[PDB]
Amino acid sequence: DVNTLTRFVMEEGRKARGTGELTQLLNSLCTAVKAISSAVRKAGIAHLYGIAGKKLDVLSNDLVMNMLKSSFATCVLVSEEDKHAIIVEPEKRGKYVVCFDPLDGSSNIDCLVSVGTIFGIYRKKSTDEPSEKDALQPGRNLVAAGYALYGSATMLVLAMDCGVNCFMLDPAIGEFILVDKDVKIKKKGKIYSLNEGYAKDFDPAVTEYIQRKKFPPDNSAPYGARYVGSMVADVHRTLVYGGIFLYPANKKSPNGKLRLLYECNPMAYVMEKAGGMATTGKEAVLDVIPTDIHQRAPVILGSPDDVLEFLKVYEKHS
Amino acid sequence: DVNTLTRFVMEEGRKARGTGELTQLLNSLCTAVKAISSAVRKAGIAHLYGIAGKKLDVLSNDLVMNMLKSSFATCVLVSEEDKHAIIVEPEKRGKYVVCFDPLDGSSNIDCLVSVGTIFGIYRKKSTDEPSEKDALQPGRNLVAAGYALYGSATMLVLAMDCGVNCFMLDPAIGEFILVDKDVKIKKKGKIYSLNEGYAKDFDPAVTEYIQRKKFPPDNSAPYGARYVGSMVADVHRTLVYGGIFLYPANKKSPNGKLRLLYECNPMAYVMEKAGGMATTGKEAVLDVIPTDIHQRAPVILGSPDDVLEFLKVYEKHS
Amino acid sequence: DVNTLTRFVMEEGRKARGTGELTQLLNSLCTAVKAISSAVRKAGIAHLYGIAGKKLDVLSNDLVMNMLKSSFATCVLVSEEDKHAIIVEPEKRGKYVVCFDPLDGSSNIDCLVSVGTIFGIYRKKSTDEPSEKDALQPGRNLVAAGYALYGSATMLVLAMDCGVNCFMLDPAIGEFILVDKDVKIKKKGKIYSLNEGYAKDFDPAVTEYIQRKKFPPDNSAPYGARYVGSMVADVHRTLVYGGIFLYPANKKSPNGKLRLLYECNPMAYVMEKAGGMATTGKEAVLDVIPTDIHQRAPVILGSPDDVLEFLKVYEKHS
Amino acid sequence: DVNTLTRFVMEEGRKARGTGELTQLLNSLCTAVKAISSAVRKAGIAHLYGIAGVKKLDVLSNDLVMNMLKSSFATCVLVSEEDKHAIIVEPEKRGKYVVCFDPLDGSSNIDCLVSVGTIFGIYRKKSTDEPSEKDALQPGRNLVAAGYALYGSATMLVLAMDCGVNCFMLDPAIGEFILVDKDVKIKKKGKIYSLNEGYAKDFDPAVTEYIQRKKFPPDNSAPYGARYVGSMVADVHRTLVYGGIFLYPANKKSPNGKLRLLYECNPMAYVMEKAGGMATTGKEAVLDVIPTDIHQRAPVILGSPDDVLEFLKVYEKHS
Numbered sequence A, B, C: 001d002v003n004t005l006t007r008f009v010m011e012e013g014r015k016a017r018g019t020g021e022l023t024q025l026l027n028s029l030c031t032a033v034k035a036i037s038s039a040v041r042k043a044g045i046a047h048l049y050g051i052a053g054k055k056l057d058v059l060s061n062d063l064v065m066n067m068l069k070s071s072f073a074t075c076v077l078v079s080e081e082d083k084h085a086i087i088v089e090p091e092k093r094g095k096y097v098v099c100f101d102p103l104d105g106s107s108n109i110d111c112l113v114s115v116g117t118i119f120g121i122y123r124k125k126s127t128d129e130p131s132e133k134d135a136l137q138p139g140r141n142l143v144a145a146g147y148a149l150y151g152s153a154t155m156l157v158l159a160m161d162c163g164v165n166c167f168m169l170d171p172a173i174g175e176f177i178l179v180d181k182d183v184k185i186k187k188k189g190k191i192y193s194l195n196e197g198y199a200k201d202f203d204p205a206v207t208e209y210i211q212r213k214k215f216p217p218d219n220s221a222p223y224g225a226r227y228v229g230s231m232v233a234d235v236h237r238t239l240v241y242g243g244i245f246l247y248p249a250n251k252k253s254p255n256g257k258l259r260l261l262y263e264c265n266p267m268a269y270v271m272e273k274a275g276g277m278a279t280t281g282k283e284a285v286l287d288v289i290p291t292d293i294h295q296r297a298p299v300i301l302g303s304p305d306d307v308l309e310f311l312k313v314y315e316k317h318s
Numbered sequence D: 001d002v003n004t005l006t007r008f009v010m011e012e013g014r015k016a017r018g019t020g021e022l023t024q025l026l027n028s029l030c031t032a033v034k035a036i037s038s039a040v041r042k043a044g045i046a047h048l049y050g051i052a053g054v055k056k057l058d059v060l061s062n063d064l065v066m067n068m069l070k071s072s073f074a075t076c077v078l079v080s081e082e083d084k085h086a087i088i089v090e091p092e093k094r095g096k097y098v099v100c101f102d103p104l105d106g107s108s109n110i111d112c113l114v115s116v117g118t119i120f121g122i123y124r125k126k127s128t129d130e131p132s133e134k135d136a137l138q139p140g141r142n143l144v145a146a147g148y149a150l151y152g153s154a155t156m157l158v159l160a161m162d163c164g165v166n167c168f169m170l171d172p173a174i175g176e177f178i179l180v181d182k183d184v185k186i187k188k189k190g191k192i193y194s195l196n197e198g199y200a201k202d203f204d205p206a207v208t209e210y211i212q213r214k215k216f217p218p219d220n221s222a223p224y225g226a227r228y229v230g231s232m233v234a235d236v237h238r239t240l241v242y243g244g245i246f247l248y249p250a251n252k253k254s255p256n257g258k259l260r261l262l263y264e265c266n267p268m269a270y271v272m273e274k275a276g277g278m279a280t281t282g283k284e285a286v287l288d289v290i291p292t293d294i295h296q297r298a299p300v301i302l303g304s305p306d307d308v309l310e311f312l313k314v315y316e317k318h319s
Ligand SMILES: Nc1nc2c(s1)CCc1ccc(OP(=O)(O)O)cc1-2
Pocket: A009, A010, A012, A013, A014, A016, A017, A018, A019, A020, A021, A022, A023, A024, A026, A160
């Protein structure tokens, strides 16, 4: 029996026996994602080059912003693109808080590298006037999270309490088709991913760990290396093929470079729901209690045995 | 003035003052590429999952094979997908030889990583009955070469004697729009690309070179690292942002890992026509005379200053 | 504030405060319509003609049939394509009955004339085992009805108790965009539509009426004539521009030619919810009590003043 | 062996053994047609309705054709319904062809989603002087190529040349026109007549009698079915595929007809004749009319030969 994102979402919403607000939020998000995908694949670029005789990042943010606001299901919106949290106008306020990166990896979208949209959805816990404080919740409180990868094909990975599900966007009918149910990451992978250009500033634990991947002390086969530079792409590969992804801290970046609210938490949530792990080295990403909507957080995620091994090395240096 | 791949090709062909055969070959290749793109983005996948109640690489190969044969411009076709060179039936024989990889990086297509089509076009040099020997020409004899990158967007890079030109596929009208005329690679980049998981087996010169990128002896800023795993993606990034890409021999693959005819030569041609370099370490990729259609070849390409620097290190270890 | 078919449907469903079944049904139908649209515009026809080396009406029927069944919201399905009503297997039964024409006007599809999908939704009113009898309800009992016109662009007209709304399918993102809220037909039009090739067999009332349109009683300008041959196209034009559409009974077809359950009723419902009228001449189409799922019914619909005028002539001949 | 518009055009151009200019012209036209199709199917309409928080379709269509032809470097004079005057291509972009076209026929009624299309006729500049409106004033008999794009349930491009008529289906998945009907020929006789009967009151006697014969056959044969979409491209295409007759004659009010000779009548007349059909004004073949004004009107009766001949018999009976 064929399944679409819309049908899947409506059914889960029906089961929750609530107001149906989250369903509207997800539907709106889904539509925004297809709009972003269309723009990312350069639909209509011919008109830009004069066939008939301005930024993807900003457009992507506008799409998500507008779709979520008009869903009447949100009250506070945090975007990697805005300095301050956006407070939805009173007449369109819903009970959910959404943190997202409209177009992750857009910094290098010129080489046509894969890009994506990352998002995390929380329920406003407080009754107070909606404010940026409502987005300051530990990833452990997530109701739903996931991402859209605009790669060779467009896929939406959605994670909730019930697990992780992957949907493929069929451009012929603009429909997200369920192609992978209750996804689980491999217990152990054969691929490690991180920018080794930072080697000189690597934390000792990171240096030793990568060294064990290249020169396994047990003379087993070394891990292969992959680093796209776009978190969505690297994390998705990690989920599908298993392995480990790192963007750790160092003397010069005590807290890392990726952002906790809309990059680390959503990915940590997906990973844990898929049987994987996500750590800052000192603790689970999802347990970090944020104080700033844009605060950074180090992150090591992927296959459990691989993350556990990293933590072993980390511990050795603590 | 807007320009399309079709218009551009027809114009160049008109100037060459020939039979117009290459024009038909390129037109057919262009069509095959759009077909591949449509399938790679998963058009119609809903039907595969039962909305109404072959493998991508095989389909891709069929598309190119069929379009080239029916162009009446080719006589010998070598594909990464077929063990033997395909000899075009007599009634459809043209004077060109085409070596191509229908879907480069398809091995890791499950993670939605970028994939592409690489191609190299030669003029049949020998007058003997067409055979696999017609494809055994040094890259230096290429009439045209290039690739299609199916990434965030689909782009076709075409290289000829007159230079390199980039076209963006506008999905709205199925037209390749010229967006970058006479492209030239940066003299020097800030990114190095290669699978460092092979560190253990790297040749000494490669080890030292990478070491210089991470720990500049001149204490300048270290190069950033990126490795997608898909040659088309990695090479395209190198072209756009400059830098260097490597896939040198391993102690486990003494003759390199990438294939000379449909991976190395085409990319080397694009690089040289863009002002860059491509070497096996011992010589220019384009000068290697092939003896086997699927023989491997090491390859170091990218910005001239960067490749020259690698060659300096290489020499120091020779 | 932008609105989509999905968002609109979910909102109306949320207000009805029911099980959410009709929502799932409509969502499923919407997806089927996009699939039909894609096939009607000939997506992938290149493969049919050998680029790489079933009938549209059958496919359309399969799409609707499969999407409805898998919605878990239907129990009885009547299609212009099937002699007998389809009874949904027990494990997929819902409380709705759907009568539809998968691809209206497909008989003359070879000329690329507009085609469409017509549908009428009823709630099973009985407590017995689902059967063909559940589809034999007067149009007056419709819960929702409408159609998809596959013309210059694809539009879905949906009618319910709250009125008529028009959605435009945006091929770029496969989303139905609301472009016309609470639509109302003109009180009086200037166009009449019917196959005048039947003149010889016309009922006297029809002859006189058409005569009044060509040679106006109040020396008013004559009505313009338009007859596409596809009910969906002709009816949609009547809705948008006002006027009147006819397919009356004659000497050989005393019960008309169009089918009551999936052609006449749906259109009559749309018309009345838009402030228009639909009559068989003797009574309102929606009041006819069917005895056979495929029975025919004459039909005169469109602007109220126009239909009333027809009825005046009709009565003069009774 | 699969064939596309591009491959087909390039091959015919290669055969002609010329400069390759017409090939570039056709390529450019093909591209413009796909862009028009995309817009007609409402791609991106969501942005117009605020999904992220605008010119008329006929204007845009005209701009696309205009821009693509000019940049083809193959044209010198362009006539479109949109501009009162013929456009003279700037010297540095001049080619030897003259193109008359209707960017978006039937756009007067595009709100009801009725079929619309693009009609075009290509001539070779036959003068030695400075390009001017006068170069577009050639009888349809001089056409080098003509055809149309129908934006209906699907998008098809009908191309006619000396070698015959060929139909291409636009595959939206790959933006390619696929040849699906080679050397098309219209039925010798059809069973459908098409014209706006709302003008009955002003019909010329010959037209009145002819329509009368289709509804009430003399030999008591089966009457013809009636079809009138209101969009010339749709009505004409139906006529080509199913055979029959299409009419938009002159009457009392409209003495020289309503349709335009250069970009509506001539192109369709050329397609019809190359397909074995006919196109007459009643007094003579549409293609033989020598124009004096780029926007002059001309009556037109076209379709299956036997049907047109029959019309002409009635017409003569009233002359
Ligand atoms: N479409 C989905 N809705 C929900 C999903 S999926 C998971 C759990 C959930 C919990 C509460 C809830 O409350 P509202 O219905 O938003 O009031 C909604 C949902």
